[PDB]
Structures are given as structure tokens and as C-alpha cells.
Design a binder for this molecule. Structure first.
Ligand SMILES: Nc1nc2c(ncn2[C@@H]2O[C@H](COP(=O)(O)OP(=O)(O)OP(=O)(O)O)[C@@H](O)[C@H]2O)c(=O)[nH]1
Ligand SMILES: Nc1ncnc2c1ncn2[C@@H]1O[C@H](COP(=O)(O)OP(=O)(O)CP(=O)(O)O)[C@@H](O)[C@H]1O
Ligand SMILES: Nc1nc2c(ncn2[C@@H]2O[C@H](COP(=O)(O)OP(=O)(O)O)[C@@H](O)[C@H]2O)c(=O)[nH]1
Ligand SMILES: COc1ccc(/C=C/C(=O)c2ccc(OC)c3c2OC(C)(C)C=C3)cc1O
Ligand SMILES: [Ca+2]
Ligand SMILES: [Mg+2]
Ligand SMILES: [Mg+2]
Lengths: 54, 437, 428, 334
């Protein structure tokens, strides 16, 4: 019902119609997490190479 | 003028990126070689299109875009394709081996090796910016790179660019055009890691787009090219207010202000009309009322769900073509009486409307017919949680048996991250619940 | 990653391996000299996966030919496409394995293995991004079974982050050389469970049954059996060899097909089943292809799929056809027989279509099933093993090479565990 | 072959429906959590509507309308009738009703209760039954649930012989096309003890449920008078038919309720489809005026009628979507 904020230019126009009123981790934390995953990877491959050496 | 940088991650992001930048060029009259004759200020300036394009002394208009993929297949097609001159080689980053549909491999294993190169090539574009406002991030939920690497990049961008806004264009997985059986796993994993780092995210369900192409474009079995041309139209509609003169959604901060009152609930639904076949011999052109009415039909949404059984927090209508405010208001008053449109109590029942007089541009020889008028509605409705419910249930089915988990653990991810990611999703489904019913 | 290093060990390994290279060379338009005499560029786009480009438009199979006996490798070198192989990739011993896994794995093969690994390394170094290894071998003899598994173990030590794929021919009393085959197979299966990512179970029982019961051939030869192996092998490698919708590779196959690491033994299938020479003139429709490729009569492992459940399925259709009709027929099988697909892996069937059909067929379909019914194959071998082992019969052939009974008990134990592991998910 | 899932074990209507479907030999029943179904016979509460219609190569149908609970809970039914312009406050066929909360419209209720006292006319209300307002408000706060207070029908139609009260149950099937089908057989759920004008604690003569009664079975079997007998009684006693005196009003009420909610619940353009069987409960006053009492979203049938109705549900609601190789319904045209 109520039209507000009407702005017009050569390209077009914009407006608001209201019908009814109302009632992060650090760099250190990322680099530590990514390196912790590599330590889990290193350990699993080392366990495989130990198994194969057996 | 304040610049935006577009980031395209993995296969889906890159291919959609191509579709969008093809369209942006056709919209601004920028040639495949980068020349733009209508631009009278050679080699710089602060026009509205400079938000997405920088300029060289020779007059080349170059995208503020970085393409990143862990294998070279897809980006090589950018490197050699019809828009090759547009990007400089530094904007196109590839590895040798992909993430094999594995979030943990994209995030932790291959992610660690390529992240610093990507952030450096991002910093290259950010240095050419007088007033960088933030980032537009294109990726799939389902891919290993699209999910895994994106979430890592998004974390780092918060650290390196704290003041900047981050927006997502995300492809939600559909069995109709799927790559991996573990797509639900990757989706929940990426959403959980990305949630604190995304300000506003536009989800596109591949199922919805597929069926739109089948029903409205008469395409028997839609290709990625078919889907991407359609997506690019929707993306272009969303970003038009950044690239043209106007007073609505003119900066990225305004997307959060206008669409996201609740920061966690940052997934607005996009609905688009009309989608018309170029092969249709006879076409009766559709009015402002007819196209605006179409914005409330499930068949036209980017995500199939039922807004009648949810609540609204915000609503934008973005028109392109022959549209005047008088006709918009006449259309709205009629629709409000005929349709179930329930806003939340702590929000006004209202619509923010933007009109651009230029009708949508279609790619020559595409599937979309030229139209006199078009509209993209952006509504933040709790009904979109239907998609989270669907996705979480598929996750639950697999994870009950710990199926495929070893592939993730094998890349050095702890199994606890699965249940952490899932609990966050359960918390999100509850957030929507409180607001919605 | 795209390059695959192919290894073929022992008699069966080399005989099926040679047939694989004959078939895929014809598909890619390569002649015995190695010169491309094709026409479609699609033949060349992913040719570097199996072929190394040589001096002057010549294509050299990335193939290593291994035996403890000079016999079979002379027959390859003198065979149809024999000239195509790189001469230095012929790695052979002299004394043979005598159908003895212990000779292959511990004594004779241990003497020759380092030489093979030097050739593997030379081929690995030529690779821009090596994705992994495929091995052809039987499990019933000594060289393919014993030395093949030794090789796999050593390759995994040297390349622990690469994929190991095998085509593993399972022994049957229906087509048998020696009584000791169940021993060799059981010792081998033990190695495959631990050291491969993907194994195509090629059952000689099934191949005999298809030849006899279905293909009308009253006395099947090895040649008749190997006609089925090459049609299957061509089909399972299609998406690696041709441009596709998915950009298929060995690692993605593993991630997507294998929900639990030990359960990586695939039941392959082919439609239509044909015998040599006699070409059938009527082409199969898509409903016919889909029906046959799921039927037990078309499985390359002698297991009834109705006795278990599909964990995952991959299917590759070849020829000019309605891709929509392919979707509809494949969805029809799943929606009408949903009890035979685990409900706890959603959307567990993936399908591709390739434009290029195999030689002599307008329409074909290759099945790759990870079914729990594969336990039937391992139980069959395990029963044959036990009937001998409970009397320690024929054991002296192995104890004479320094093997102990303890190693036999462990191999048997691990294969029985595998069986119960399959059963666990057949009821869940 | 078609497929279905059964997700409500306690439902007798859909026990018989699933049994009839199996008997065709063209319907196979699947496990509770099997997503690859054509038909869902769903759970009463928390039905996962959002998971429906997302299965490639399957047309999916469910035996419940999402949003229909607004008609089928007392609290929401009043709010719907009070707020919908198609129904409204001056709605002649629904008794005066007020939403009451315990820790809302209590001040709206008591102000209208005064008009009933200052006019000195009949002032009996139902939540249990009392003639004084604050008598059962002390029982509302005691319960701790949102129950509505409604004007009690003090002058009801009474069957002879017996001077008894009753209610009419109507079975209504709404298909996927939003056709409204009234089952031609309804049931009168009779009282067996005579209606007492000034003794409201005597619940057996005032509340006419099948459970409360079970003089039970004296006048008719299981306190159930069907349509043939009631029509004959109306012809004998009052010189009128069931059709003219009562059924016209019933058909009007059913059409009015379901028309009102039609835009909110319709599955006409949805990715999945709905049908639903409803039980409407009617009261008749002494001047043959029909009043709506409530709507049942999960109704149970009468024993005699189970077979005929359940076949009808299979006929027009199930086989209309999924075809195979007289009508018991009256189509309420709109
Ligand atoms: N709409 C659309 N979806 C795509 C496209 N390419 C891939 N997808 C979807 O993205 C998901 C698979 O992820 P991809 O983006 O292909 O994988 P990726 O990010 O390259 O990661 P990798 O697994 O390392 O290759 C699936 O849901 C596909 O349906 C595209 O061009 N358009
Ligand atoms: N306003 C009113 N005036 C007269 N009688 C009323 C009334 N409200 C309720 N009743 C009587 O009380 C009985 C039960 O009322 P109601 O229909 O609310 O309970 P209920 O939900 O258990 C029946 P159902 O089993 O069909 O769901 C009815 O059979 C009716 O006779
Ligand atoms: N399908 C098939 N099976 C074979 C072939 N040659 C041998 N076999 C089987 O392999 C087993 C014998 O192993 P073989 O490969 O001859 O021994 P190796 O030379 O020591 O590897 C038996 O089960 C045979 O049936 C062949 O060409 N085709
Ligand atoms: C259950 O869902 C899936 C199952 C398997 C895949 C496989 C993806 C591949 O990359 C791949 C790799 C090798 C292949 O040949 C053996 C194939 C292969 O997949 C296709 C192209 C579909 C067919 C064969 C993906 C899934 O989602
Ligand atoms: Ca300029
Ligand atoms: Mg990729
Ligand atoms: Mg032999």
C-alpha cells in the first residue's frame, strides 16, 4: 500500500513497498589444524611402511 | 565505486564462472578480446562496470576474477576457449590431481599445497583495487575441490580480509546430474566450515534447474551448458545492481542488510521468470503481473520447496526490461490477497523493488528466448530449510554405517568432524524451526 | 592424474593382457607397428592413459610383461599385436613356478622381482601424473598368483599414494590345471584384501557357464573364455580411455564404489554375451541391455546377485542411443527391485554413456557391481581349501619352499573374515 | 508394479487400504525408511513433507495435506474461522468460540459472557460442561493446555423413542485435483441415556462419543444409527428427508471449510501430490439447523463401512494417479 524511497536514474528505478508494519579462528589456528591432519597422515603411512617392513 | 572480486572454485564454479563472464561481456558490450568501444574513458575510471572489470592502457577490460581447480581439465578450456584473451594466465590456477570427490582431500591434503599460491594471486587483484568491498565465491557442494578447498579459502579470507563481505553461489547436489555418491557428506562438511565465513549465500539446486530446462526449454536431457546458461541469467540478475546505475543492493553490505536479518539464516531463495524456449515458434509475451505471480510458483524456484509452509524475513524483486513501479504495485496487491505470504512478526511485510530498463541479454544461439520483461525474486524464507532436511537425512543414512568415512579419515580428518558438522546442521535446522513455526 | 601402468604376470595374466592390448588398440585406431590409422580425434584425447607417445607418431603401450617361464612371453612377442610392446618391458625368468604360490611369492619370484620394479620405475618416471597400476593375473597358478601378489606388495611400498587395480582370474574345478589352485587362490586373496584398492573378480566358473549354458559352446577353450574377459576389460576401461561426462579415473572409482576398504571386490557383467566369429545381426534395445546386464547369466563372477545386495553399482553403456531412455531403464530396475540395493547408500547406481561402440556391436553395456553376493565366490574357494587342508594334503609342495602351516591358517582366517564382513552388510 | 510405504501402524483405515492394495498384486509394500516409493501412507505427526517429490523416475503421492492441521485442531479451527473473510465472525454454522490460554482471548470471551447474563438468556458453555464461566477456567489453568471455550448447544434435536442427544460424522475425501468427495454413508453416534436439561455433570447423555457409551447398544447396535434409518425417522417423525433438512447444510459447511484453506494446501503445481480423508463432526439443533463441531485429520471409520470406504479411497484417490487394468461419493462441485 505505502510506496517509499523511490530513486530514479536513466538506467531504471528502485523503491520499497510496505504492505504492513512489524510487531573466526586466527592464522595460527588454521595452520595448526592443517598441520595436525598431516601428522595423522604421516603416522598412517609410517604404520603402513612398518607393516610392509615386517 | 568499490570493487568486487569473483572466485571460481572446482569444476562447477569454473563452468558457471565462464557462463557468467560470457554474459557480463554481452551485457556491457565488452568484446571477447576485452575491448569496450562504448567506454570513452580509456584505461581506467570509476564507472559501475568497473566493480567487475579493471582496464589496461590498451583498453582491455579484464575481469576481477580468479579461477582455481585442483586438476587442469576444465580451466584449460578457459585457457584456449573463445574468451581466452579476457583473462591473464595468473588468474587461472590449476593443479595436476583433483580431490577425488573427497572433502578432506580438497581441504587438508591438496588444500594445504595450493592455498598460499591462490591467496597470493587473490592479493594481486586486491592490490589493483582502490576500495575492495569483498568477494563472490562460486563452487559446488558435491565436489572435493568445490567443497573442501572453498571452505579452507573462506576461512583464510576472514583472516586476510576481515573488513570485507563474502557472498556465495553454491550448487546443491542432485541425483539427476550427480558426480559422487558422497556428495551429501561433502555438502554438510563444507556448509559447517563455511557458515561463520559467509555473509549471504545463494543456493541453486541442480534438480530445480534440470527440471526447469526440461519443462520450459523442452530439453530432453539437459547438459551442464544448458544448466549454466540458465544459472548465469539468475546470477546476472542478482549482480546487476553492482554493475549498473541504481539505488538498491549497490554494495555487498546491502545484500546482508536487505536479505539477512539473522546471520546464520543467510540462504535466500531465488525464483526466476520467465524461462522461454528460443525454439518456440509463437510466443505471447508475459506481463508484469504474470511474471511477478510466477515468482510464487514452486516450479520456478532455484530450490524446490513450499514457501506457504514457512515464513518470510525479507523480499527483493529485481526486474529487467519494460517495467514501471505502478504495474509492480498493482501486481503485488493482487498476489497478496490470493497467496499465502506470511512474514515473521519482527519484520515488516514489504518488498524492496529494483528495476533496470535493459531487458535480459541472451547468449546468441542459446536456449533462452529474448523477453520484454523478466524478474528475479530474492526471498529469505524458512521454507529453504526443506533442502537442509533432505540433505541431512541422506547424510544420516550413510553415516549410520560409517560408510565411506575411511576415505576422509585417510586424508587425515578426524571422524569427530563428521558429527560436529552434522550437529551444526541440526542446530541450523532448529534455528529455521524457531523462526518458521 | 591420468597415466596408468599396466603389468601382466604369468600365463593367464599375459594371455588376457595381450588380448586387452589387441582389443583397445583397435578401438583407439592403433596398428601392430604402433601407428595411428584411425579417423576420430576422440580416439586420441585420452590415449596417454594407456600409451606412451614415441618416436614419430608411434604409440607404445605402458605395459610390463612378467613371467618366470619364457613360454607365454614368446607367444605374446610372436602374437597378433606382439610387436607393439616395448622390448625392454619383457621381464622373464627360466625355471617357472609350477603352479606353486610359494615359488612365485618367496623363492623363484623373489629372485626376479627387483628387475620388474626397475621397469615399473622407468615407466613411472615417464608419467606426468601417474594415477596408478592395473595388474592382470590368475590366482590359481604360481607366477600370476604368487609373484603377482609379491609385486603388488612391493609397488605399494614404493608408491603408497597410488591406486592398485587388479583383474584377478578366479580358479574353478570346471576349468582346472591342478588340485592346488584353492591353496594358491586363498594365499592370494589374503594379499588382495590388504594391498589392492579395486579388484575385478573374473571367475573361470562363470566364464565356463556362460560359454556352455548360454553361448551353446559344448567344449569351451581358453580362447572362448578370454573372448568374455576382453569384452569385459574393454568395457570397464571405456571411461578411462574416452572423453566422458564425468572425467573418470581409478581413484574416483575407489572413493565412490568402496564404502569399507576391504570390500573392494567387484562383480563385473557384460551384455550382450556373444561367442567368437558368429556375429548376431539384430541390435539390442535399451530395455534389453539393462535387463541382461543385471541378470546372473551375464555376471563374470559365479554368484547369484539375488542372494545378496548391491552396495554400489557403476554401469557403462556404449553406442548411439537415447541417454534419456538409459536413465529411465536404469531407474526402472532400481525402483522395481529396490530390495536388492542397500537403502543406507543413497543413489548408489551411477551410469555413463559412451558414443563409441566396441567392434562388432552396435549396442553394449558393462556392469561393475559391488555386491555382497561375492561372498559366494570366497566361500566356494574356502570350502575347496578346507577339504584339502584338514588333511594337510599337497602341503609339501609349499613346505619345501620354506612355508609353514601357520601361513595357510592365517590366509584362510582372513578370507573367512572377509566372507563374514560381506554377510554383516547383507542383513544391515 | 507400484510401491508404497506404511508409516502409521495405529491407523485402521490405512491398514485396510494397504491390505486392499496388496490384494491387487500390483502394489508392493516396502520398509519404513525406503525412499523409492510411489505412495506414502504417512505418520500422523512430524510427517517429512520436505523429503517428498525429489525422487527421479517416481511420481510420489501422500495421504496427508500439509497445512490441513489448521482445520483439524480446535484452537486453530476457531482462529481460522474468526480470521478468514470467507468464513468470518458472523459465520452462522459455527458456535460462538473463544481461544483460552493458561500460564489469547479471555477478555473478549468474558465481555460476551456478560451479554449472555445481562440478557438472562441461556448461558451454558463447553471446553467438560458448565453454566458458569469461571468454574471451568479453574479447570483450564489446572490442565495447562490451550483449549477453546465454546457456546454449548442447549436445545439439540432429540431422537424418539429415548429423548437422546447425537452427533453426525461425515467422511470426506479430497483427491490430488482438490475434488471434494463426500462419502454417501455417514453415521449418527447416539447417546443411550435421555438428555438431561439441568444436569451437566452427567457426561453420558451430554457427550456422544463411541468410547464414553461403551444403556449402550439398546436402541441400535454399538450406538450407531446409519442414514437409511435416520432418513426414515425424519420422514415419520418430522415429515422431511435427511437430504433436505440436514445434508444441504453439511455439504455447504464441508465445501466452505475446504475452499477456505485450498490456496494454502493445494498440491496442484507441487513436486509431490496429496490426498486426505477427513472426518467432519456435526450437531443438529431442534429447529433442524446443522452446526459444525470439529474436523478430524486422522479419522476412524464405522465397522460396517470400512470395506466400502477403503475401496473408494483406493478407487478415486490412489488409482486415479496410478492406473490399473457406481461411485460411493457425492462430488461437492466448485
Ligand atoms: N550446475 C552445474 N553443476 C555442476 C557443473 N559441474 C559440476 N557440477 C556439480 O558439482 C558437483 C560435483 O562437483 P565438481 O564441481 O564437479 O567437483 P570439483 O569441485 O571439481 O572437485 P573434484 O572432486 O576435485 O573434481 C555435482 O553435484 C555436479 O552435478 C556445472 O557445470 N553446472
Ligand atoms: N458446543 C457444543 N454443543 C453441544 N454439544 C457439544 C458441543 N461441543 C461438543 N459437544 C459434544 O461433545 C462430544 C465430543 O466433542 P468433540 O467432537 O470436541 O470431541 P472428540 O474430538 O473426542 C470427537 P472425535 O472422536 O470425532 O474426534 C460431541 O460428540 C458432541 O456431542
Ligand atoms: N580365463 C583364463 N584362465 C586361465 C588362462 N590361463 C590359465 N588360466 C587359469 O589360471 C590358473 C593357472 O594359472 P597360470 O596363469 O597358468 O599360472 P602362472 O603361469 O603360474 O601364472 C588356472 O586356474 C587356469 O584355469 C587363460 O588364458 N584364461
Ligand atoms: C555409486 O556412485 C558412483 C559410483 C562410481 C562412480 C565412479 C566415478 C569414476 O570416476 C569412474 C572411474 C572408472 C570407471 O570405469 C571403471 C567408471 C567411473 O564412473 C563412470 C563414468 C560412471 C563409469 C565407470 C561414481 C559414482 O557417483
Ligand atoms: Ca574507463
Ligand atoms: Mg574436478
Ligand atoms: Mg598354466
Amino acid at each position: 500500500m505505502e510506496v517509499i524511497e523511490l530513486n530514479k536514474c536513466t538506467s531504471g528505478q528502485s523503491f520499497e513497498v510496505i504492505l504492513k508494519p512489524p510487531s573466526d579462528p586466527s592464522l595460527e589456528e588454521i595452520q595448526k589444524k592443517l598441520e595436525a591432519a598431516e601428522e595423522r597422515r604421516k603416522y598412517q603411512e609410517a604404520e603402513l611402511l612398518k607393516h610392509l617392513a615386517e | 565505486m568499490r570493487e568486487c572480486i569473483s572466485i571460481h572454485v572446482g569444476q562447477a564454479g569454473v563452468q558457471i564462472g565462464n557462463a557468467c563472464w560470457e554474459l557480463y561481456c554481452l551485457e556491457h558490450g565488452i568484446q571477447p578480446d576485452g575491448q569496450m568501444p562504448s567506454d570513452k574513458t580509456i584505461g581506467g575510471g570509476d564507472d559501475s562496470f568497473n566493480t567487475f572489470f579493471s582496464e589496461t592502457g590498451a583498453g582491455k577490460h579484464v575481469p576481477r576474477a580468479v579461477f582455481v581447480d585442483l586438476e587442469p581439465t576444465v580451466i584449460d578450456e578457459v585457457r584456449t576457449g573463445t574468451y581466452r584473451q579476457l583473462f591473464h594466465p595468473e588468474q587461472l590456477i590449476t593443479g595436476k590431481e583433483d580431490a577425488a570427490n573427497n572433502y578432506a582431500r580438497g581441504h587438508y591434503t591438496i588444500g594445504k599445497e595450493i592455498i598460499d599460491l591462490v591467496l597470493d594471486r587473490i592479493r594481486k587483484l586486491a592490490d589493483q583495487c582502490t576500495g575492495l568491498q569483498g568477494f563472490l565465491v562460486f563452487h559446488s557442494f558435491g565436489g572435493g575441490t568445490g567443497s573442501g578447498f572453498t571452505s579452507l579459502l573462506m576461512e583464510r579470507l576472514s583472516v586476510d580480509y576481515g573488513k570485507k563481505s563474502k557472498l556465495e553461489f553454491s550448487i546443491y547436489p542432485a541425483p539427476q546430474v550427480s558426480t559422487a555418491v558422497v556428495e551429501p557428506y561433502n555438502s554438510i562438511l563444507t556448509t559447517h566450515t563455511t557458515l561463520e565465513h559467509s555473509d549471504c549465500a545463494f543456493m541453486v539446486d541442480n534438480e530445480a534447474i534440470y527440471d526447469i530446462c526440461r519443462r520450459n526449454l523442452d530439453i530432453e536431457r539437459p547438459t551442464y551448458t544448458n544448466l549454466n546458461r540458465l544459472i548465469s541469467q539468475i546470477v546476472s540478475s542478482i549482480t546487476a545492481s553492482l554493475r549498473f546505475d541504481g539505488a538498491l543492493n549497490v554494495d555487498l553490505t546491502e545484500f546482508q542488510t536487505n536479505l539477512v536479518p539473522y546471520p546464520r539464516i543467510h540462504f535466500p531463495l531465488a525464483t526466476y521468470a520467465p524461462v522461454i524456449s528460443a525454439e518456440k515458434a509463437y510466443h505471447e509475451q508475459l506481463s508484469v503481473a504474470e511474471i511477478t505471480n510466477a515468482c510464487f510458483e514452486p516450479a520456478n524456484q532455484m530450490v524446490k520447496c513450499d514457501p506457504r509452509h514457512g515464513k518470510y524475513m525479507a523480499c527483493c524483486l529485481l526486474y529487467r526490461g519494460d517495467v514501471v513501479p505502478k504495474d509492480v504495485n498493482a501486481a503485488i496487491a493482487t498476489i497478496k490477497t490470493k497467496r499465502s505470504i506470511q512474514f515473521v512478526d519482527w519484520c515488516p511485510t514489504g518488498f524492496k523493488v529494483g528495476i533496470n530498463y535493459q531487458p535480459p541479454t541472451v547468449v546468441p544461439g542459446g536456449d533462452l528466448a529474448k523477453v520484454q520483461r523478466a524478474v528475479c525474486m530474492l526471498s529469505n524464507t524458512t521454507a529453504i530449510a526443506e533442502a537442509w532436511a533432505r540433505l541431512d537425512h541422506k547424510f544420516d543414512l550413510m553415516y549410520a554405517k560409517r560408510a565411506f568415512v575411511h576415505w576422509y579419515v585417510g586424508e587425515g580428518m578426524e571422524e569427530g568432524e563428521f558429527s560436529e558438522a552434522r550437529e551444526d546442521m541440526a542446530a541450523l535446522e532448529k534455528d529455521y524451526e524457531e523462526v518458521g513455526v | 592424474m591420468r597415466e596408468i601402468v599396466h603389468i601382466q604376470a604369468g600365463q593367464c595374466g599375459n594371455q588376457i593382457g595381450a588380448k586387452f592390448w589387441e582389443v583397445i588398440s583397435d578401438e583407439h585406431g592403433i596398428d601392430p607397428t604402433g601407428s595411428y590409422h584411425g579417423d576420430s580425434d576422440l580416439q586420441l584425447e585420452r590415449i596417454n592413459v594407456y600409451y606412451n607417445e614415441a618416436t614419430g607418431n608411434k604409440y607404445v603401450p605402458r605395459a610390463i610383461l612378467v613371467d618366470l617361464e619364457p613360454g607365454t612371453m614368446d607367444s605374446v612377442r610372436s602374437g597378433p599385436f606382439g610387436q607393439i610392446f616395448r622390448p625392454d618391458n619383457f621381464v622373464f625368468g627360466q625355471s617357472g613356478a609350477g603352479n606353486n604360490w610359494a615359488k612365485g611369492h618367496y623363492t623363484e619370484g623373489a629372485e626376479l622381482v627387483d628387475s620388474v620394479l626397475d621397469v615399473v620405475r622407468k615407466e613411472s618416471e615417464s608419467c606426468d601424473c601417474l594415477q596408478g597400476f592395473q595388474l592382470t593375473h590368475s590366482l590359481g597358478g604360481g607366477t600370476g598368483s604368487g609373484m603377482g601378489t609379491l609385486l603388488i606388495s612391493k609397488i605399494r611400498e614404493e608408491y603408497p599414494d597410488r591406486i592398485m587395480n587388479t583383474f584377478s582370474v578366479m580358479p574353478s574345478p570346471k576349468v582346472s590345471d591342478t588340485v592346488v589352485e584353492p591353496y594358491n587362490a586363498t594365499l592370494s586373496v589374503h594379499q588382495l584384501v590388504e594391498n589392492t584398492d579395486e579388484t575385478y573378480c573374473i571367475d573361470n566358473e562363470a566364464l565356463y557357464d556362460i560359454c556352455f549354458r548360454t553361448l551353446k559352446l559344448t567344449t569351451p577353450t581358453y580362447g572362448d573364455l578370454n573372448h568374455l574377459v576382453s569384452a569385459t576389460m574393454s568395457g570397464v576401461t571405456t571411461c578411462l580411455r574416452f572423453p566422458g561426462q564425468l572425467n573418470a579415473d581409478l581413484r574416483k572409482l575407489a572413493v565412490n564404489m568402496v564404502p569399507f576398504p576391504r570390500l573392494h571386490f567387484f562383480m563385473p557383467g557384460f551384455a550382450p554375451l556373444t561367442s567368437r566369429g558368429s556375429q548376431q545381426y539384430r541390435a539390442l534395445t535399451v530395455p534389453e541391455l539393462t535387463q541382461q546386464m543385471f541378470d546372473s547369466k551375464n555376471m563374470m563372477a559365479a554368484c547369484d546377485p539375488r542372494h545378496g545386495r548391491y552396495l554400489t553399482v557403476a554401469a557403462i553403456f556404449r553406442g548411439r542411443m537415447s541417454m534419456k531412455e538409459v536413465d529411465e531403464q536404469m531407474l526402472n530396475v532400481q525402483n522395481k527391485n529396490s530390495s536388492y540395493f542397500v537403502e543406507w547408500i543413497p543413489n548408489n547406481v551411477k551410469t555413463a554413456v559412451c558414443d563409441i561402440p566396441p567392434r562388432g556391436l552396435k549396442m553394449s553395456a558393462t556392469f561393475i557391481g559391488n555386491s555382497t553376493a561375492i561372498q559366494e565366490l570366497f566361500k566356494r574357494i574356502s570350502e575347496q581349501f578346507t577339504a584339502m587342508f584338514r588333511r594337510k594334503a599337497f602341503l609339501h609342495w609349499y613346505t619345501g619352499e620354506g612355508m609353514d602351516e601357520m601361513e595357510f591358517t592365517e590366509a584362510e582366517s582372513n578370507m573367512n573374515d572377509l566372507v563374514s564382513e560381506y554377510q554383516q552388510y547383507q542383513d544391515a | 508394479m507400484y510401491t508404497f510405504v506404511v508409516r502409521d501402524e495405529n491407523s485402521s483405515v490405512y491398514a485396510e487400504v494397504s491390505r486392499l492394495l496388496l490384494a491387487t498384486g500390483q502394489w508392493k509394500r516396502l520398509r519404513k525408511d525406503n525412499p523409492r516409493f510411489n505412495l506414502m501412507l504417512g505418520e500422523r505427526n512430524r510427517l517429512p513433507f520436505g523429503r517428498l517429490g525429489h525422487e527421479p523416475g517416481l511420481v510420489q503421492l501422500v495421504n496427508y495435506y500439509r497445512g490441513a492441521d489448521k482445520l483439524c485442531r480446535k484452537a486453530s479451527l476457531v482462529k481460522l474461522i474468526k480470521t478468514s473473510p470467507e468464513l468470518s465472525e458472523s459465520c452462522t454454522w459455527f458456535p460462538e468460540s473463544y481461544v483460552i490460554y493458561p500460564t489469547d482471548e479471555r477478555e473478549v470471551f468474558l465481555a460476551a459472557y456478560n451479554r449472555r447474563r445481562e440478557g438472562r438468556e441461556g448461558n451454558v458453555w463447553i471446553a467438560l460442561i458448565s453454566s458458569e464461566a469461571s468454574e471451568l477456567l479453574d479447570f483450564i489453568d489446572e490442565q495447562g493446555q490451550v483449549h477453546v471455550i465454546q457456546k454449548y448447544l442447549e436445545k439439540p434435536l432429540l431422537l424418539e423413542p429415548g429423548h437422546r442427544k447425537f452427533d453426525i460424522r461425515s467422511w470426506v475425501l479430497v483427491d490430488h485435483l482438490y475434488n471434494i468427495y463426500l462419502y454417501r454413508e455417514g453415521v449418527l453416534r447416539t447417546s443411550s441415556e435421555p438428555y438431561n436439561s439441568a444436569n451437566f455433570q452427567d457426561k453420558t447423555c451430554h457427550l456422544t462419543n463411541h468410547c464414553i457409551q461403551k444403556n449402550y447398544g439398546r436402541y441400535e447396535e454399538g450406538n450407531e444409527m446409519f442414514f437409511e434409518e435416520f432418513n426414515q425417522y425424519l420422514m415419520d417423525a418430522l415429515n422431511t428427508t435427511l437430504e433436505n433438512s440436514i445434508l444441504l447444510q453439511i455439504k455447504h459447511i464441508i465445501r466452505s471449510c475446504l475452499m477456505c484453506i485450498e490456496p494454502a494446501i493445494s498440491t496442484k503445481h507441487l513436486h509431490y501430490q496429496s490426498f486426505q480423508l477427513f472426518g467432519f463432526d456435526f450437531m443438529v439443533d431442534e429447529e433442524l439447523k446443522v452446526w459444525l463441531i470439529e474436523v478430524n485429520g486422522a479419522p476412524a471409520c464405522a465397522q460396517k463401512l470400512y470395506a466400502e470406504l477403503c475401496q473408494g479411497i483406493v478407487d478415486v484417490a490412489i488409482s486415479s494417479v496410478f492406473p490399473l487394468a457406481t461411485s460411493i461419493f457425492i462430488k461437492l462441485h466448485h
